[PDB]
Enzyme design. Structure first.
Site, short mmCIF file in Angstrom:
data_model
loop_
_atom_site.label_atom_id
_atom_site.label_comp_id
_atom_site.label_asym_id
_atom_site.label_seq_id
_atom_site.Cartn_x
_atom_site.Cartn_y
_atom_site.Cartn_z
CG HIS A 176 3.76 3.85 3.83
ND1 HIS A 176 3.09 4.21 4.97
CD2 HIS A 176 2.99 4.28 2.80
CE1 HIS A 176 1.98 4.85 4.66
NE2 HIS A 176 1.89 4.91 3.34
CG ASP B 115 4.24 4.66 8.12
OD1 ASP B 115 5.24 4.95 7.42
OD2 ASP B 115 3.11 4.56 7.65
CB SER C 8 0.13 7.39 2.75
OG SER C 8 -0.46 6.16 3.19
#
Ligand SMILES: *[C@@H]1O[C@H](CO)[C@@H](O[C@@H]2O[C@H](CO)[C@@H](O)[C@H](O)[C@H]2NC(C)=O)[C@H](O)[C@H]1NC(C)=O
Lengths: 223, 103, 218
Positions: free
Chosen positions: A44, A88, A181
């Site tokens: 992402h 992911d 992230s």
């Protein structure tokens, strides 16, 4: 990182700071160097143009230990699921090989289908926000525990223990948060996880991509 | 307005928020309508989290909250087609927080 | 205004521009030498004290010494509910009074109670967006409208330029809807977008607030 401590400068020399730009907006993420020419991060975090900074501690300073390299290729897992944030994982093939040194060097990946027992102490690091109100210019880190999968399965209906790791104690204010992230879950000096998602509040537990479940795709992509 | 404002935003869908730190570009020193901004929010919902118009339609709830520079907040119901007929300054938006629950 | 026509210079001297950082965000109506009246949502998320009330304007792209300019001292509202868009009206007191003249004249409002119905011919006006991505209008626009009682809700005066795609648009919020000489409306909201030719434009019913209006400007 919420509830953590400033990193010792250059103590985590695999850390990558990512600045992602696209026509509609930007993103900032972490990542980690896994070979002299590849950075692993979250899918992402993908965007049109990705700048990678290795060797950094204060990303607001043009420190002379920093190496700036653009992502020549940004390879999202082919079955990345944007709706549920599954699969992911993304590899960045860097434009040039990094110059390896004390401040820049890769981190080991786990062995195939390697597992993580609940209670395992891991460290997570990043340049993300430390609260709703405040950020950080320098690298921070926090120690977190691997949880039994049931802790995440009820909160995050799309959690899959085969491909993800449940991390963090619900009663603690210690977690990864916005901007972290793509950074690694480090357990016993190996990158077992990738910071992926959690609650808007930042309250634990939170979900990490389980690196060991993607090792074939990783290997195939890098060769 | 060639330079753009970079407005922080967050997206939570079904209690899941990705942990990147993201910003939406708006033309600097521009005026915008709630139709323009809502459409940008819808585009972002789709391109970042795959949230379709049909999904906003069938969701239990689907809103975004603008925090203005004055400190005021406006909550916009994405399920609605009613737009106030006014204009507002892009430089006045400090934060946008988007939340969709299909519960 | 979408699908409209340039107003004659100073045709409607009760028309007002509300500016902020040099930006016409809403229109308004000189209701008293010291009072303008607009839509409540036009000021619910802004710093009032920056807002400038401009009277006697025609072409906002041009300097017009004819123009009078003021600043807001106090706002007076009556229960604007944004969630359901009820009571979308505000009256604003200026930092003075205007010189009533060839370019600046106080408007005239309807009687409390007066309602109007299907088929009335009214005029809308404003400096909102012109519609074909032509951008915001610098010269004030006006548009023949017909009052419709259709999908229209019980709590609004709704209008349609039936037969073509025209209507109010963004930046027209607050501007007056004049019916038989009387300011019956304050632009409040559109449906789906501008000039749908599907949904009427929704105006706040000036005639429903006449009571409170007098109670503040006498
Ligand atoms: C559109 O509105 C304008 C303004 O009311 C109309 O021009 C008026 O014409 C009426 C006759 O119907 C006269 O009472 C007035 O002298 C005119 N007013 C002004 C300010 O000039 C115009 O005729 C309207 N057109 C339609 C189709 O309704």
């Amino acid at each position: 990182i919420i509830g953590g401590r400033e990193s010792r400068p250059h103590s985590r020399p695999y850390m990558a700071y990512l600045q992602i730009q696209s026509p509609a907006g930007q993103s900032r993420c972490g990542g980690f160097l896994v070979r002299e020419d590849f950075v692993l991060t979250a899918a992402h975090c993908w965007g049109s143009n990705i700048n990678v900074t290795l060797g950094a501690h204060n990303i607001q300073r043009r420190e002379n230990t920093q190496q700036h390299i653009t992502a020549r290729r940004a390879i999202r897992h082919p079955q990345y699921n944007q709706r549920t944030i599954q699969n992911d994982i993304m590899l960045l093939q860097l434009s040039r090989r990094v110059r390896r040194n004390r401040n820049v060097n890769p981190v080991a990946l786990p062995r195939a289908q390697e597992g993580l027992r609940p209670g395992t102490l891991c460290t997570v690091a990043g340049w993300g926000r430390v609260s709703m109100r405040r950020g950080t210019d320098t690298l921070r880190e926090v120690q977190l525990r691997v949880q039994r999968d049931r802790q995440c399965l009820r909160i995050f209906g799309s959690y899959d223990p085969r491909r993800q790791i449940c991390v963090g104690d619900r009663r603690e204010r210690k977690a990864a948060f916005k901007g972290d992230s793509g950074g690694p879950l480090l357990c016993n000096n190996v990158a077992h996880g990738i910071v992926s998602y959690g609650k808007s509040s930042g309250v634990p537990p939170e979900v990490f991509t389980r690196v060991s479940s993607f090792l074939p795709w990783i290997r195939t992509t890098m060769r | 307005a060639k330079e753009m404002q970079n407005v922080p935003y967050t997206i939570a869908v079904d209690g899941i928020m990705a942990f990147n730190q993201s910003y939406l570009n708006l033309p600097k020193d521009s005026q915008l309508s709630y139709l323009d901004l809502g459409n940008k929010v819808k585009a972002l919902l789709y391109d970042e989290r795959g949230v379709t118009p049909e999904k906003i339609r069938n969701a239990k709830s689907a809103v975004y909250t603008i925090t203005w520079k004055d400190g005021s907040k406006k909550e916009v119901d994405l399920k609605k087609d009613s737009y106030t007929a006014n204009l507002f300054d892009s430089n006045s938006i400090k934060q946008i927080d988007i939340n969709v629950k299909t519960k | 205004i979408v699908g409209g026509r340039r107003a004659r210079p100073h045709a409607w001297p009760f028309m007002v521009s509300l500016q902020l950082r040099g930006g016409h965000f809403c229109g308004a109506t000189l209701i008293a030498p010291n009072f303008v009246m607009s839509a409540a949502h036009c000021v619910a998320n802004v710093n009032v004290r920056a807002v400038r009330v401009v009277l006697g304007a025609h072409n906002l792209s041009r300097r017009e010494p004819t123009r009078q300019v003021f600043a807001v001292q106090r706002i007076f509202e009556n229960g604007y509910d944004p969630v359901n868009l009820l009571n979308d009206i505000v009256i604003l007191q200026l930092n003075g009074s205007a010189t009533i003249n060839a370019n600046v004249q106080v408007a005239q409002l309807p009687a409390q109670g007066r309602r109007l119905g299907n088929g009335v011919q009214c005029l809308a006006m404003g400096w909102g967006l012109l519609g074909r991505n032509r951008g915001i209008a610098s010269v004030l626009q006006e548009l023949n409208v017909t009052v419709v009682t259709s999908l229209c809700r019980r709590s609004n005066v709704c209008t349609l330029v039936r037969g073509r795609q025209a209507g109010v648009c963004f930046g027209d919020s607050g501007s007056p809807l004049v019916c038989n000489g009387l300011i019956h409306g304050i632009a409040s909201f559109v449906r789906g977008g501008c000039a749908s030719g599907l949904y009427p434009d929704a105006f706040a019913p000036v005639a429903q607030f006449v009571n409170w209006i007098d109670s503040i400007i006498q």
